[PDB]
Amino acid sequence: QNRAARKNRYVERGSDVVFGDQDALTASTENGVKLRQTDRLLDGVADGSMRSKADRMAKMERRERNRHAKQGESDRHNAVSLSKHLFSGKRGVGKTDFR
Amino acid sequence: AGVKAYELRTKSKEQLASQLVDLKKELAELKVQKLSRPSLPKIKTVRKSIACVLTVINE
Amino acid sequence: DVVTREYTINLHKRLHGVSFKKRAPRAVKEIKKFAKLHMGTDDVRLAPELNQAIWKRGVKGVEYRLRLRISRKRNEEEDAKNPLFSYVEPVLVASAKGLQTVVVEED
Amino acid sequence: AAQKSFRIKQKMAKAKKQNRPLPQWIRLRTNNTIRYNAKRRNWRRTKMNI
Amino acid sequence: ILQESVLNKYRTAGQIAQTALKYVTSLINDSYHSKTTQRQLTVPELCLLTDSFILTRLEQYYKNKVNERGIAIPTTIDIDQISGGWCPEIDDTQNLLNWNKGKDSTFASSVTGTLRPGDLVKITLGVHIDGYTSEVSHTMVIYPVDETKPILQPTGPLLGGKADAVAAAHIAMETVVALLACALTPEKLPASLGGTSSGITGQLIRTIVDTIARSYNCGVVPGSRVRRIRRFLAGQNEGIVAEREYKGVVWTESHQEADLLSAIPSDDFVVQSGEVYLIDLKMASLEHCTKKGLVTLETVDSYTGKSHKAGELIARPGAYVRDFAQTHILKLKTSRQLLTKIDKQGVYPFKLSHLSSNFPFVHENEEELQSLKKDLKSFRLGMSEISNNYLCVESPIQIARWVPWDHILKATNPNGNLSYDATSTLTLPGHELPLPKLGVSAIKLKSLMNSTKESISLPVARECNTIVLCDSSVSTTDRPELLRLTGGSKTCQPSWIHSQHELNPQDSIVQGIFQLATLAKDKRFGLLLKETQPMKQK
Amino acid sequence: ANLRTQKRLAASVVGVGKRKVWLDPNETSEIAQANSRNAIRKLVKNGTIVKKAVTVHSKSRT
């Protein structure tokens, strides 16, 4: 065990000196994209101040659909005002429309 | 920028055909560059040059 | 105050009349309550080997008695609300009967 | 269906390319009144009916 | 902490760098000035042969004794307006010609790779041994050769703004060397320049350099610095990699704004004994600027479709930087092997040709060059995926540009401080404020530079040395002295220039500079400046 | 950390069910780096991922 512990030595290198406590060195993307990956949502807004402004605009727009509890932009289910099968009852002595 | 139709109209058929081939090669190169850069404004002017050359030939 | 003792818990009278699907989970909760009673620590942590010993005969086959080693130790994290906690370990013995509470020397 | 017709696949391709939210720069235009995609489709909400 | 071994490593690296610089100067003179050679060497060939010469010389020293050694800064050759980053690979010649077809003739020397008379050719290279780094950079001038004279000599001196820039850079280099040597004998500092009991400060460094640039009608290019060098931390990639501790003086557009109005670098330091300092100075000529403007930098990309500008240079950088804080398992086997070699290199910028097993070549052969290019094509295939996952970055190609102040003042930015380029790959220049007082960001300033019709380019001259402040114990002769590891009168010998400007002696700073020159020329009772000698070759 | 993908890839690479793959709970960061079947194979080779034996169905009583 003493031989193994002496064999397993820790010798630092230039990468340990330079990058050991740092990180990043590249701007983190907003959609987790690679270098040459298209970003459909953001490719037309070059600067981050205008990106943040448009994002805040979209968040403010979302509020009424969120209050109506829509599963998203694509949820446009429409309920009828009245259902005839629920409001067309005059039940005789015989066969009914439900049990 | 781009080609000018009045300048094109003084050329012969072979000159216009060679210019059309050069423009098509340039459009291919710009389409390669677009895969890295989504905003490449010269694409519009090369496309319109191709259309103008074809218009002059047809006339 | 750092301390370590060995206790015997009577799970039989604690699990008397409990529904069969709930017996071993109630044993877990009862041992936590036991450690809280004996050490004053609301933070009780059970060893996975102790959990194995509880669940060893399935959901309704909990032993009548269990020999536990309970250690009150210091909480090192700054984010915690409690400076002390209890760690419960199992003591695997020939029999859990006839054993009294003992203080384990700390070295 | 796995074995589908080219007409069906062409319509599916159009639907896939249409499936997106607004580009952000549309919000920044002068007098923009378009604030969300009001024709967005989802596979589990409205069926395309071929 | 200095020691005999550290000083020896610095001396060895400096000697290698001096020998390489002498080699490239001789190669340029044989290709263009002596004209004895049949084939004229081009810029990528010069860079490649220089790197090979450095590696072959470095193989002989410190074998089986030092963990890491190699080229610190890859051999860069910059022409006129191009202020740095020009180390093109040999397999990019036809690419450069095709990209720049239909352009102007302003960057003809860099596009073709063949130098032209009147060019300011800046040569920059550096060597590291055990992380101990020595860097040198020298501007030289390309002259037409005389015919009537028996001996090959230029027909005349360099005249004009290029001469002004060369003189400003050279005089600033000499004065800064003298001033930093005066830190060892503070009582020898001239009284007018600074206090007898006062030390050397970044404020004094900045004001002397600015005085010289102002006298010669030049600006200081925003990449210049006079900083301290430590092991593995030499500013080999200053605009890309961040540093925890910085001691030195820099020039930026913000400093230009403050001067006109009157991890963060600051000029609140005293130059202390037993330290290694890098002095890198770039002077931009303001000959064609009929107004007062701002000196900035334009970055070069490889996209010909980004504009319709005729005087734009299209090129791809040849040097990459490995970001060791980023990890990602690549999908290509070629990519994984290339990453293994790149991690073998170190924390210094590298070329793809440096990673080939054939390189450095024992015998310069056509088949050796062909095998290197065969490796290079697959290296490019691997490099595309390595850079697509942010494992390496490009060290940029930059051109010095001039933007007049009236355009900046009249321009309106609705966002002010808040605007920043979010599509930039590198965080350090992407989140940059060149004008803190005016609230003008980097992306706004680039927009203004591109919108101006009076935004011209400026020729740049460069001088960069490494020095060590040896104490009484560390030096041989029991007295403190300044050991210049690279540069001096043997390698960085100035070209034949003539300028219409000079320092006006009615200034106290100018008188202090002249006193420093006197004490430097004195070798008995003055400053002791010991220059590192190149080793012999043939 | 979420190692669901690595667990599925380990099962596919080793050729057994997901129920038969052991991911070392101490080497979570190393396992989380492994996004390809090649890296998964390396982890299997050095022992960060282990194939479990089959649950015994003895026939001695039969």
Next chain:
Amino acid sequence: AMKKVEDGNILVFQVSMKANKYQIKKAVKELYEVDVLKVNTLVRPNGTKKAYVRLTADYDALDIANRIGYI
């Protein structure tokens, strides 16, 4: 797609929806001066056509990728 260059000497192109394998082979040989071993094609779920073009052993697709400009 870039894996296929080093994996099987294959170039991947987006081609016209009206083009068949003969036309793809002819166009590739005319534009890039290579001999083509074979062409496999498909229609992507966005409605465009993808062509895998495998070249003969006399030609290297790595050279063609370097010349074209993406690498």
Next chain:
Amino acid sequence: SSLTLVKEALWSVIDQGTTLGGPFFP
């Protein structure tokens, strides 16, 4: 306004020789 004052200050502000080397190739 500090921006106004800085802009006006900038507006107000902007409103033998020497020889090195010789006839030889270093």
Next chain:
RNA sequence: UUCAAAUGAGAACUUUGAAGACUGAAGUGGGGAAAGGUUCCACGUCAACAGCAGUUGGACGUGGGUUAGUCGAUCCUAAGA
């Protein structure tokens, strides 16, 4: 159903490990046909939705992915049109 660790502002519900059980091959397994149409997979990520919760998702955001001379269609005729 239970235990510890990790992640996290926050974990009964996420991940790994430790355990207890279940489907028990007419399966809670492995594939297809009709139908659907990207739901597949990766990265980012939680306002709304997942009748508790949520750091998770078939959700939201950005992309990647379907390669045939031999498998089908295509050809033949059936009741029929």
